[PDB]
Design a protein around this nucleic acid. Sequence first.
RNA 1: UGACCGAUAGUGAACCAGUACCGUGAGGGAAAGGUGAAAAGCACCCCGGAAGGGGAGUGAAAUAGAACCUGAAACCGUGUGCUUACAAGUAGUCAGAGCCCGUUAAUGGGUGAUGGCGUGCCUUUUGUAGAAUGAACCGGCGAGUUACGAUUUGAUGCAA
RNA 2: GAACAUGGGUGAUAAGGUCCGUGUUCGAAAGGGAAACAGCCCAGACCACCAGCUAAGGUCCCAAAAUAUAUGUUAAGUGG
RNA 3: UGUGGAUUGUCCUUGGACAAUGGUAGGAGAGCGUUCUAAGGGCGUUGAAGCAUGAUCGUAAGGACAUGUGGAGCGCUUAG
Lengths: 112, 116, 102, 49, 47, 145
Amino acid sequence: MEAKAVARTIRIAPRKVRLVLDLIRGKNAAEAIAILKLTNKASSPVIEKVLMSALANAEHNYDMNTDELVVKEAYANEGPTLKRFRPRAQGRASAINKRTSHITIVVSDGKE
Amino acid sequence: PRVKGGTVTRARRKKTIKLAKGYFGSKHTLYKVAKQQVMKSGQYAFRDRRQRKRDFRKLWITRINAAARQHEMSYSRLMNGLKKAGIDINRKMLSEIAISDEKAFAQLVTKAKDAL
Amino acid sequence: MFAIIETGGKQIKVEEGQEIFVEKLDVNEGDTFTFDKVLFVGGDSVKVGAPTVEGATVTATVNKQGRGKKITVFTYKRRKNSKRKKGHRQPYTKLTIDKINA
Amino acid sequence: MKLHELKPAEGSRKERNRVGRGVATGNGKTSGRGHKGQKARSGGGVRPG
Amino acid sequence: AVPKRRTSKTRKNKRRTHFKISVPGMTECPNCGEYKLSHRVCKNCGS
Amino acid sequence: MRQTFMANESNIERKWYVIDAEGQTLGRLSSEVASILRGKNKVTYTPHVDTGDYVIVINASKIEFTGNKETDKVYYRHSNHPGGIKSITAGELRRTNPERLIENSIKGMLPSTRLGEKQGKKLFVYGGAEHPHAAQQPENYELRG
RNA sequence: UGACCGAUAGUGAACCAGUACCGUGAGGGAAAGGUGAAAAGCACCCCGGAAGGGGAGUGAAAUAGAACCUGAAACCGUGUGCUUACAAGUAGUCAGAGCCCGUUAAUGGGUGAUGGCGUGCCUUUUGUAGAAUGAACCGGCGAGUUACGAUUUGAUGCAA
RNA sequence: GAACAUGGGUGAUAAGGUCCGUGUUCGAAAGGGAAACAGCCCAGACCACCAGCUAAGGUCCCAAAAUAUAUGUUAAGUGG
RNA sequence: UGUGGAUUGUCCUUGGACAAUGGUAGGAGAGCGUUCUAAGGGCGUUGAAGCAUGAUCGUAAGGACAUGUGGAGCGCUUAG
């Protein structure tokens, strides 16, 4: 049995939230939150909230253990981006993109 | 009646991308480069389809020349005497016998040695 | 034991109990073709002959007689506007040896 | 005859020749008009005489 | 001053081989059921 | 396609030979060694696998050459540096480090492929001292065609 | 009424059109259709300040939840079988070990230690691997047509 | 239109120069030899094959085939 | 040259032939597929069109058939 939890649309570049997802992959939940409460990244408290919500999904729906839990998969898909504009010199103007992410995390127990 | 194109331009473009399966880089994704690589593959296969009958032929000669120097003889001489004794044998068969039943080959050398 | 027969336009080597592929023969499926042109015969009695050995190969049962794999032949010019595309399927006959005469 | 098996006279109707539709037809790209000059221009050519 | 050719997905993923972050010290608190920073203190981590 | 024996690994066996260059003329004793290193003297030689045996010399300080090539025929070498032409050694380099002399000569008649470089690592030349490979039971080839 | 169009088509405009917007002014002038048969538009419980999830419930369907019929490429990711740190490369093709597979059943399929051969594509040229021109990639659209005459060829009807 | 070989003019019995004449090849021709080399030598690809005989050029190693035989010539690495 | 096959133009008047089959600008001939109409006969909630995958069939442009996704139309034969 396994539990999952998706955020769906987050104001943060997907390439910047993929640098903190390669540190809590294939580890214990207890050590996972500890590593997320030490990194000084901008996407550290966001991932923690999702990871903390996924651990509560297998405590009321499946009512399983918490100490004997391991994060199985953890990725982040791209989402819709907003188009902006920035005035440059000589009248010409450039373009700005505001991409979003779809952070997802599934928790298992080391067995299918 | 206006005949708008569709389900015919992608059906023929999906048949050229399937032929370029196993290429490195974007030569198995983009169709503009896949067509060029598939257009050269056919020109190569046909060009080395006649070069395969020259490599194997040269291979047998090298093998027969190495199995003829053990009996104090030369390929040129061995062949010359093998044609003077009226013997019709392929170069692929001669080398096949030398690698297998050595006794047979040994006797053949003697037959082409007294025919000189 | 092993003989050196020659059919179609080349020469082969039977082992008295091994399947071989040759050119389209003038027979039918489940027939019996016999090669009357041996160039060499050794293994137990090294017997080499000039034109032949006066010993036609034992009749070999004929099996599958269909077409081969399809190959595509393509060719084009450099800066010229010329190209050609065709398909080929060389026919063949499958048979197995069981005996041998000398 | 029938309206679902009617056939026309042999060698009575032919297909029109469409120019510029490939290189296999033999009448594409230049569409049998040469290379350059004033006879290869759209609506070009001198007066008849 | 301008790229002559475009980079591929293999040469771009080869340059991002060292681009990563290192793990922290994580000085486990003696007895408080929390986590204190290396040579630091917290309101939860007693030690 | 048909029947053509193809030599592979765990099916071929290599041996050890010992040649002596006492009264040889370098070049003539080099072409006969290259063939043995390439394994072009066997009936089961394939051009896609490493076939052949190892060769060992014991007299690289006795090699001789006819003509005035002992004073001429200088050896050049560059170091990828502005004016790095190195020609200190000429034809009388058989007295100082003569092992390289034969080594290069026999390495100049082999293919420059990925398999032609590993085939040139099966040759051991010695100035005049005896070889320490007595646990390989090397056969004495000496006599050359 | 139609061998007329069916959302880049047909009117510039199927919807917020001469409207956003642009110019002192005359003026120029877009983009944008589709949940389901019926809102029955997720009551309730759990994590979070909220957004959004996980169960449950409504329905034939919830990967039909208003980024709402179908959902193709370019592009971005996670898992996994075989392979890679002495090597010079228009990246393929011919031959060929080893290690895994099992089909529209056939002298099957995936991967590739080594060997031989090999300077992209279009245009313009006496001649282009060319250090001559064009194209970042993918998808949609984009060039011998019709009316009336002249001459020649095939087909059919009647024939001085 | 171009090179190659010949027959001339022009220029300096200069030019991968320029203008005519007679042939061949390239243009519109792949394959083998000249180390690489549209125009030089040999030869004109309907398709299959792990068959055989030859042309120019070649036979110590790279790299298919003589470390062939007989006779002279050459001491410069001439060959190159 | 040997052995099997494809196309022609001939020939002889049913398959052995006889020859022949590099190709640019061009000339001539035979075909494949797309949208709509007519007639005849068909398929479809027991799942149409589209989309994805496959080791299949034809001398080429191409054509079938299973399996997954999808939820209402679409093929085939002759001619225009």
